[PDB]
Structure formats: structure tokens, C-alpha cells
Design a protein around this ligand. Structure first.
Ligand SMILES: Nc1ncnc2c1ncn2[C@@H]1O[C@H](COP(=O)(O)OP(=O)(O)OP(=O)(O)O)[C@@H](O)[C@H]1O
Ligand SMILES: Nc1ncnc2c1ncn2[C@@H]1O[C@H](COP(=O)(O)OP(=O)(O)OP(=O)(O)O)[C@@H](O)[C@H]1O
Ligand SMILES: Nc1ncnc2c1ncn2[C@@H]1O[C@H](COP(=O)(O)OP(=O)(O)OP(=O)(O)O)[C@@H](O)[C@H]1O
Ligand SMILES: [Mg+2]
Ligand SMILES: [Mg+2]
Ligand SMILES: [Mg+2]
Lengths: 6, 510, 511, 275, 5
């Protein structure tokens, strides 16, 4: 969903 | 006890109280007027250096005396009248004619080398030089001058990440000669960046220690373990020896900081990305927003660090491409120069390519920024976010960048747990307020907008799926029954932005 | 020994006692009128500097003489009459005048003393400014003034959660200049909030330290382990250096605090939510109830924070909706503004909707309040509650809010002559100000809206429908027996009057 | 208070101020022209030895007077004119001459001061001798000279590995006599070579200790555990006793070094491989 | 009842 939150 | 003013006098006249003075001369003259005790006088009469007896005399005095009298009535008698005249002059240009104090009794000792001492000791970072954003640094200095009178206040220099705030503050406390010495005696500049809950206590551990003398940096106890009420009391204690002290809180994330800063009645400059932390404070709050570098200032910035200015038309275009892409951003612009190697406009357009098909990682570099690339920053900016806002944000990918677009046009892709979608607007607002990720624009019609850097962040970062899902989930609502906004007769065909959609469809199929 | 006046004279006239004087001239005269001794005089007579003979003469003199006579009867004869004239003039301005200066002002800029130094050091929070509740902060300052003579006393500034008590206390000790300096010497403001049993001792540990000198905060021991009788004795010890000290006990939950406060004979302002803790104290217990912000004070409150006043009728109606929902409540009102973004009446009504179909979570925001939302506050208030009162409260959902309704109409939903219902509902209003009592025409209670919409999205979704049914049941069983006006007893049989909201509640519990 | 010249006079003329003088002769004259106090004069007047009255007169005198006048206007009248002539001559060689000596040489054999004592104590390595790369060591010394006025600056002597950078730095601070003493007061030469993340702090721990007095190296605490803001504040603390101090950062690999170097507003020569 | 009070 979020590649390691960014 | 004295107060911040009489102690500001005792602090301003310290180069002098060090050059000619001695506490033994006054211990005898002061035991009489009742401002000491025989341990007080014991502690000060037997001290190896004079700087010791002086620091203990001025510490003990600021706590002990009912007023700043019996120290004027002494520098006089001791033929050190050159002192008591200065302090009585300051106190008279304080009670009777206020204001007149900074120009008259405070300014005639400024020295562009004393400043550097106070900045360095106050951990102020080295101000940047080859370009200064005039406007902002000026208004910071102005609005700080307006408040130096105040007992406690917040100045919020808030903006996007890498937008240049801290640097602007570095210059704002380094440009004038007035702010430190004239308006404020000292500076304490501390980098926060706290996310944990222990961060907000550790910060003020290093405040408490930023205040403390080079002496009694030795005596530091296992303070790591000691209550909040006590670190706080220890501070408002140790805060006496620091008259008008400005506090820079570089990179505040937790509104807990702001609550401590406001319980401790501190004077604060605050660099931050999330603005809502200010609702935590009930007080004089003033704001200065660090906008994205206007198209012209970027030119100035380029010129500023040796950049060849265009000639061909498709060269000014190469650079307007860069300014659009790096949607006005100091940090990524700097990374850009630093990564422009041969310096040619050619390799500059090379980078302009590199940015869309490899993202920010095409230009990530060793830069004056603590960060290799802007993605490491927005990282943090995205973690703190409300879970739902993390979602809304996760979807604003599937838009057209650098385009002003309606709320309903957003209601289509943005999640929500009926018929009025303003909740979308509420989210898109929190989203612009909190890291400056969006961009609100009230009229002609309530519309938001996503910039290009703030987009290409999301490009190589959100789930490759969630992109294609947003594109299709958009293509559903897509039918129902230039410097000009897209009309309601024409929303059914977002195909106007086909270009910037063909690039995502091509993207999510690789 | 002297006293404050005569020592004020020997201290005041020192700039003077240095330019012209010498203790040797007086040593014989004092060895003589029998007020010195030849070692005393020895101590003052062989001294290198004149400042020595002077400092020892002024220290040494004060113990032996019953008064400051044989020093006026000396500067006269010695041609140093310009001194004895000052002192005789002063003695005339005190023996001959029964009026001087009182505790008031002669060294101005108390703006940095009391306002800056003592409030900050006593940990008093930075008073609110953009709006002040006149009446209450005023009555606080007044009623505090009446008591500064007293040795120990409780002032209970009690109300609902977020009802604004602490802020009023912030302002009452920050507005006037009398309370700190004139009426009381120092301030100690401590947040309690103790729920655990170790909290009531830890608190008074930080009192004990609020007392301690800037010196010997370093020397702080592992005091954490030492009996209560000793911490108490240690405070009333360290309480000598503290003449007239005011104690704010911000946020009391446990009556054990109050018992300690009452063993230590302290003078206490107390902000709290639960009012009955005062029964722990047998004493001048004095009370000030923080009522709900009237609709008009709410208007004032709105204006104060840049909020546009209505014009169309269904906008003033929108705002009476907001003031009604958040049943006069400072905190949720503030959160409300902070969350009103564009400032428009439109987005304001947006929130008015959001509040009924999403509860307090619809307006939760970063606010000067320690709490994200008032539900976070009431949380505790419900946890502290007697298990049975926790029950009664848990059922009072299914009533009509902002409606005054009889006890029997309540005996139907509240668990257990059923006056016991009334007893629970009394305890319930006393302890977090959760209900609302109204004695005549008939003993009737009422549930406000915030205190209702708390329970909505919080009580068990089933227990709602069960209370709705258990009521429509006993309503039917009373069936079977056969505005500024209360609902008559000929007509309890149809709660259908409040059908509108009963129908909404219904849609909630069953979906 | 005086200053460096007038205190250089009161200090220089002490061999002289012992053979013929007495502060009591001047005590009244100084209680008089309003530059002393009867306790000051008390402190100097009841003293057993003459060396007492003299050491207290020279200590006590410097705080009260705005200048060194009422001591020239005293040795004249007192038949001790051979003193006041020296001091008036000196005041003429400073009020009347805007040129004196600068930071240069008048106590020769800087061969053991700068060459021996400061280089060795600043841990500068023993310069190479059998060959010197003229051009480069020269350009280093020159370009270092241009900057001693500056408050903080980076000089990057960068090249390949074994390309000879550190050696050139060894020679540039060991060849001239200007860089250490004339242009910069002290030298601190530290090998970095940090690869780990704990290295950039340990380094500046040994900076912090490169600063510390021969005294209080004994008192060294378990300083290993204390925040970065504090080590930094502690250095810029201990950096007062260090006017114009040059920093060699031999072998930098991590730009974190350089960031610390730049927060601490240090003056740095840097040998490195990565530019 | 009382979802974690
Ligand atoms: N006025 C300027 N002159 C030269 N370079 C600048 C300027 N402003 C910013 N930069 C470059 O951009 C980078 C970002 O600036 P800065 O460090 O002030 O960001 P910031 O506003 O503090 O963002 P954050 O809050 O994320 O740290 C700087 O490190 C520098 O490399
Ligand atoms: N002028 C004002 N008067 C009262 N409350 C205000 C005012 N302005 C803002 N408020 C908001 O109302 C909130 C509640 O006030 P306060 O902090 O006194 O609550 P409280 O009485 O201490 O409740 P509790 O005891 O449960 O903490 C404040 O946190 C503040 O955000
Ligand atoms: N006159 C000279 N000049 C330069 N190098 C010399 C000379 N004489 C011998 N050498 C050899 O060259 C080697 C490399 O020089 P130096 O120690 O300066 O390397 P460096 O630049 O420090 O490389 P690194 O930074 O990777 O350690 C020396 O260790 C020495 O053995
Ligand atoms: Mg920052
Ligand atoms: Mg409170
Ligand atoms: Mg090397």
C-alpha cells in the first residue's frame, strides 16, 4: 500500500 | 528576587563585571543590607578564581535581593562607579523612558564578533550566504523585533519539507545585529525532530543543559531519570540567569513540544512542517509561511550558485521544466545543481528526464540537506498522518499534476466510511495544512491541487496496484448522465489530461 | 533585639552609615550604658577596615539592647547629627504614626515579579486572554480574598469536564495583583490527576519539592522510599519558609489528596469534576460551581475568537444547534472552532450534522485541552464511577435529552418505593456533573446533550435497544393501570411525544 | 581596567618595581585622585613584606582606574623618576607609535616551540624530509594563509589513495613558521577514518580532549554516554581557550564528520579520498 | 458494556 511508508 | 529586566542589566554589563570587579569587595558591604547569609558569603569568599566568585555572586544575588539597589550603591563607593552608572542608566532607561533602552543603553556595545560567540554557544547553525530569500528573512526579523517586548510568544515559520525554513531562520538570526544583544540577550537553538514520546522530555533535558554554565556541566546528574515537573521546575529556575532568551525549535513535530514551550512561558521561534500543532497553544501565536520558491526567485537562486542562463528557447524551457517538476523547492533544487555535474543545460534536461522515469532518485545527492532525497523527508511527513489522511494522500496519485480541480472530481477517488462530500475537502485541507502536501484555493470554485514533486513522491512510493485501482475507480464516475478551470459541462471527460494519465497507465503496467 | 522597623532603619541608612561614622566613638558609650561587653567591643575595636567596624557594629548591636535608643543619643553629641536626625525622624514616622505603607507598591513593575517570576515558578499556567468568564473568575478572586487571613481552607471550583475550571483558576491568580503578594505570599500549582494509589504520595513529593530552595534540588535523595508521616512532617517542616502560600490542586479525582491537604493544614484551591470529595474534609469547605456557558456567554465566546455573527434565521438557528448540542461546554466549543476551518456558517452546520451521526469524534481536534475529544475526558469520569452508577448512567442513554422528566419515568430504565433511582441520579450529577437536578414542580431529572451523545457511540449497541424496549414495556405497563411545562402524569403512557429522537436512537441500536 | 600594552608595562617593569618602590607612598595619592578606596588601601597598607604591598598594589590597581595615569604622575614627584621615565617612554612608544612588534620573533629558537612543542602536542605527524612536493605543499600553505582571518572554512586536499595528501599536510604545517603561531595559534590533528556511525562522535570526543588542559585529563569521566548536542556545546565551550585553532581531519570518509565540523564552526584542513 | 469505558 505504501512502500515502507515512503 | 530580581526579574528578567534587572538581570538583563546584570547580563548586558557582564563583559564589564568581568573586566573590573571583585565580589569580596561587596560581600562585606552587602552582608549589612541583608541580601546574603553566612553560607552565601562563605561560598563566595573562598573561591580560587574571580570568575567563580562573580558567577556565584550574580547567581546568588539574582535570587536573594529584593531589588537591584545595593549593587548600584556599591560600584559607586568602590571607585568602580563606571559600573553603577551603566546599571542606573539602564534601569532609568527602563522604568521612566522605555523603548529608548535598546537604541541608547544597549546598542553602543554591539560587536560583529560577540554575536558570533553567542550564536555559536547557542548552537545556531551557520547561516547560508550565496543566496538569501530577502522577503522572508526580513519579515522574520521584523516580527521577532515586535515581540521581544512580550513575556512569551510563538513564531511559526512553517512550510513544506525542504522549503528552506530553518535556513531562513539561520539567516534571520545572523543578518541583523539587533536581534541577539539588543532585542534578546541570548539564543538557544535546538533541533527537535522528535517522534517518540520520550523525545519531548529529552529535548528539554538539553534545554536545561543548554542553559547551564560551562561550570556545572560537570555536575550533570543521572537526570535521564527525573520527573517532568522537576525538569520543568529546574528550568524555570535555571532560566533566571537567562534574561530575554530566544528559543529556536528547529523541526518541531509533536504538539507536546509546543505545550511544554507554552507551560514554560518560553519565547519561541519554531520551524515545522505540520502547522496544526499551534492549536495546542493558547497564546500570542503568529505565523510566517514559507511558500514554494516563486518562478523568478529560482532564477535568482540559479544565478546565485554559478548557473549559466539560457539563450535558446528550449533552454529557458528546460529550466521552467525543472521549476515545474521540482514545484518550487529549495532542497531538491540544490540537489539538482549538485547533481548537474557538467553544468550544461543538456545534462540538466537529462535530469529533467531522469526525474519522471526514476523519480526523485534520479537526482538524490549529498546536499546541505540532512537528507539524500526529499522522499526521506516526506516519509516522516506521511507516517504521522491520520490513517484516513494516509489513505486520501495514497490516492491523490491518480490525479493530473499542476492542475486546479473541483471537489467532486476528488470525491471520486478519495475514500470515506450519502450525498454531500465535503468530508473530502476536510481531508484535503488537513492534507495541505500538515506537511503542505496539497494546496487549497477557495475561489472561483472550491478546488484543491496537487503539485508535481508532491506527486512524483507518491509515484515511485505507493503500491503499484493502488494507482491502477484509482485510475479505473475514477473511470467509473467518469460519465454519469490553461488558466481556466474545467467546467461542469465538461467533467465527464478527464481526457483533457490524457497525457498525464497515459503516463500512469504505462507506469502501472511495468 | 530590634524588629522590622528598627532594622529597616539600620538597613535603610547604610549608604549614610558609610560616609560618616566609626564604632569606636560609640564603643565606650556602649560599653557604658550597658548594652555591650568588652569582648563585643574587642571584636569591633581591632578591625583593619572601617567597613569592618561598621558591619560588626550593626550585627553585634542588635542582640544586647532592648531598643534603638543608645545610638540616637550618640550621633547627636558626636557632630554626626545628620544621622540621628534621620533616625529620630523615622522613629517619629513610626512611633508617632500608626500608618505607613502596608503590603502594597513602592517598587513598581510588579508586572515582572508576581506576573513573571512567582507565577512561573509556582507552575501556574499561562492564563487565557481572548475571553474571560467575568462572573466566575471574579467570584473566585473575591472568595479567595475573604480567606487569606485563615490558616487553612478548601475552595472547590467544581464542574463538568472541559467546563472550564482550571482556566478560571489560571485567570484568577493571574488577573488581580492582590492574591499573590498582598493576600498570599507564594503560589504552588500542581496537577493531581491521580487514579493509582501511589499518586497521592508522589503528588505531595512534588509539593515537598515545590517548596525546596533553588539550592538543594541537586541534593534530592532517593526520597521515593520514606514513610507518609515523614513526607508530611518534612513538608510542614519545609512549610515554615512559606508564610501564606496558596495551593492549587489542579484536577483532583481522589479524596485522598484532600485528606492529605487537610492533614497538612494547607490552603487549597481545587479544580475537580467530582464534587463529593469534599465530604472527606470536615472544614470550611467552600464551593463555586462552574455552570454551563449560557447561550449568550457562548455568543461572546464565539465573537471573541473571530467568529461571524448570524443574519438569516436558519444560521442563528444553526448556532443555537451547536450551543445546544455541546450543552454549553468550553472545551468542545473550542475544539469546534479549531475544526470550523473555512469559518463559514455552512461548514459549521456541516459539523452540526457530523456530531449526531459520528458523535464527539466528528469534532475532535488539537486543542488547548489535554484531550483530543471530550469523550476522552468523560472516559475517566465513567471509570471512577460506582459499578451500579456506572450501570444507571449506562442506561440513561434511552431518555430524551434537554427534557425535564420525572423519577418514575426513570424508575423504568434505571436498574436496581423507587427513590433509589433518584439517589443514583443525584450521585450521578454530583460526580462529574453528568445529570441535572430540578427539585419542583416534581422531583425530576434531565440529561443534557453532550452527556448524552457521549453515551450514544459508547454504550453497548445492544443495551441501547434493550433500554428502548424495557422502556416501551413499562410505559405500556403504566398504560395498563387504567416548553417551560413538565410532562403530566396523565400522559406518561405515550413516550411517542419524543418519537422523533426515539426513532433515531432506534435506527442506531438495530441498524 | 588596563589592556595588553599597559599590563605589559606593569609586568615588564617588575624587576624594576622591586628595587625601589612602596605602595604606601602612593596609597594616599590614590585614595585621593579617586582611583582607590580606604579598604583597598587598607588591604595594601597593613602588609608585612614589601613584596606584599607591591603585589597587592599591582593587582588591586588595575580595576578602579580608567588608565595608567595616576602612577606616572606619582613616580615623578617621589624621586623615583627612573621608573616613571621608563613608563612614559613606553607610553610614548605606544601612544606615539602605531607600530610595535606584531606576532613575529623576539625570543628566538621557535625551533623548539612550534616545531617541537605545539606540533607534537597537536599530534601532527613527523613531516617527510627526503622529498617535498613543492607546488602542492606550497599552495596549501598559501591558501591557508589567505584564510586565517576567517572564522571557519574547509580546505579539501583531496586525491587518490596513497596519492600523498596527508604527507603534504604534514609538511605544510611543519615547513613554514607562519601557519602555527602567526596565522593560527594552535594545531589539532586527528585521524578520522570513520566508517561506523559511532566513529563521528568518538572522533569529536578526542577533539574535546585535544582541547582539554594537561590538567583534567585525569578527571576524564565516562563521557562515552552523553548527547551530541552536549559534546558539541562542550567543545564550543572548551573552544574559548582556543583562539585561531587549526584542525586537520586526516582521512575523512563520512560527510557526517564534515557536518559536525560545520556545526562547530571549525577551521579545517581535510585529507580525504572521496571529494 | 461501555466499550473500554
Ligand atoms: N536560502 C537558501 N540558500 C541556499 N540554499 C538553500 C536555501 N534554502 C534552502 N536551501 C537548500 O535547501 C535545503 C533545505 O533547506 P532547509 O534545510 O532550510 O529545509 P527546512 O525548511 O528546514 O525543511 P525541514 O523542516 O524538512 O528540515 C538546504 O539544506 C539547502 O541545501
Ligand atoms: N476563555 C475560556 N474559558 C474557558 N475555557 C476555554 C476558554 N478558551 C478556550 N477554552 C477551552 O476550554 C477547555 C476546557 O477548559 P479547562 O482546561 O479549564 O477544563 P477543566 O475545567 O480543567 O476540565 P478538567 O478539569 O476535566 O481538565 C480548555 O482546554 C480550552 O481549550
Ligand atoms: N615525499 C613524499 N611525498 C608523498 N608520499 C611519500 C613521500 N615519501 C614517501 N611517500 C609514501 O607515500 C605514501 C602515501 O602518502 P600519504 O600517507 O600522504 O597517503 P594519503 O594521501 O594519506 O592516502 P590516504 O588518505 O588514503 O591514507 C606514504 O605513506 C609514504 O610511504
Ligand atoms: Mg527544519
Ligand atoms: Mg484541568
Ligand atoms: Mg592519511
Amino acid at each position: 500500500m505504501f512502500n515502507f511508508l515512503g | 528576587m530580581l526579574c528578567e529586566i534587572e538581570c538583563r542589566a546584570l547580563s548586558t554589563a557582564h563583559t564589564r563585571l568581568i573586566h573590573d570587579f571583585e565580589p569580596r569587595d561587596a560581600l562585606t558591604y552587602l552582608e549589612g543590607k541583608n541580601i546574603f547569609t553566612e553560607d552565601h558569603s562563605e561560598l563566595i569568599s573562598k573561591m580560587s578564581t574571580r570568575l567563580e566568585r562573580i558567577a556565584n555572586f550574580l547567581r546568588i544575588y539574582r535570587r536573594q535581593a529584593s531589588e537591584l539597589g545595593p549593587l548600584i550603591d556599591f560600584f559607586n563607593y568602590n571607585n568602580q562607579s563606571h559600573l553603577a552608572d551603566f546599571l542606573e542608566d539602564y534601569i532609568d532607561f527602563a522604568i521612566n523612558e522605555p523603548d529608548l533602552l535598546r537604541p541608547v543603553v544597549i546598542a553602543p556595545q554591539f560587536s560583529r564578533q560577540m554575536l558570533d560567540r553567542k550564536l555559536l554557544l547557542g548552537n545556531v547553525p551557520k547561516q547560508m550566504t550565496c543566496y538569501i530569500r530577502e522577503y522572508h528573512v526580513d519579515r522574520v526579523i521584523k516580527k521577532l523585533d515586535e515581540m521581544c517586548d512580550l513575556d512569551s510568544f510563538f513564531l511559526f515559520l512553517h512550510g513544506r519539507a525542504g522549503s528552506g525554513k530553518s535556513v531562513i531562520a539561520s539567516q534571520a538570526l545572523s543578518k541583523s545585529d539587533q536581534l541577539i544583544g539588543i532585542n534578546y540577550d541570548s539564543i538557544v537553538w535546538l533541533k527537535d525532530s522528535g517522534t517518540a514520546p520520550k523525545s519531548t522530555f529529552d529535548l528539554f533535558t538539553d534545554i536545561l543543559l543548554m542553559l547551564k554554565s560551562e561550570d556545572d556541566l560537570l555536575n550533570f546528574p543521572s537526570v535521564e531519570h527525573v520527573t517532568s515537573v522537576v525538569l520543568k521546575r529546574m528550568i524555570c529556575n535555571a532560566l533566571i540567569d537567562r534574561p530575554n532568551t530566544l528559543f529556536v525549535f528547529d523541526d518541531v513535530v509533536q504538539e507536546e513540544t509546543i505545550r511544554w514551550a507554552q507551560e514554560l512561558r518560553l519565547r519561541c521561534l519554531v520551524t515545522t512542517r505540520d502547522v496544526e500543532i499551534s492549536n495546542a497553544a493558547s497564546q500570542t501565536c503568529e505565523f510566517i509561511e514559507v511558500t514554494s520558491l516563486e518562478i523568478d526567485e529560482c532564477y535568482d537562486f540559479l544565478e546565485a550558485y554559478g548557473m549559466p542562463m539560457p539563450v535558446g528557447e528550449k533552454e529557458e524551457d528546460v529550466l521552467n521544466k525543472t521549476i515545474e517538476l521540482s514545484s518550487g523547492n529549495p532542497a531538491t533544487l540544490m540537489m539538482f545543481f549538485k547533481s548537474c555535474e557538467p553544468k550544461t543545460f543538456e545534462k540538466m534536461a537529462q535530469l529533467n528526464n531522469k526525474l519522471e522515469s526514476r523519480g526523485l532518485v534520479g537526482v538524490e545527492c549529498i546536499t546541505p540537506y540532512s537528507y539524500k532525497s526529499l522522499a526521506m523527508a516526506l516519509q516522516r511527513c506521511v507516517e504521522v498522518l491520520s490513517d484516513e489522511d494516509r489513505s486520501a494522500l495514497a490516492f491523490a496519485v491518480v490525479m493530473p499534476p499542476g492542475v486546479d480541480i473541483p471537489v467532486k472530481l476528488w470525491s471520486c477517488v478519495i475514500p470515506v466510511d450519502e450525498q454531500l462530500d465535503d468530508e473530502v475537502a476536510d481531508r484535503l485541507k488537513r492534507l495541505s495544512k500538515r506537511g503542505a502536501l496539497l494546496s487549497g484555493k477557495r475561489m472561483p470554485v472550491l478546488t484543491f491541487k496537487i503539485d508535481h514533486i508532491i506527486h512524483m513522491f507518491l509515484k515511485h512510493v505507493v503500491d503499484a496496484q493502488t494507482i491502477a485501482n484509482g485510475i479505473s475507480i475514477l473511470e467509473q464516475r467518469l460519465l454519469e448522465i490553461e488558466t481556466v478551470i474545467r467546467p461542469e459541462d465538461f467533467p465527464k471527460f478527464m481526457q483533457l489530461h490524457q497525457k498525464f494519465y497515459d503516463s500512469l497507465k504505462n507506469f502501472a503496467c511495468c
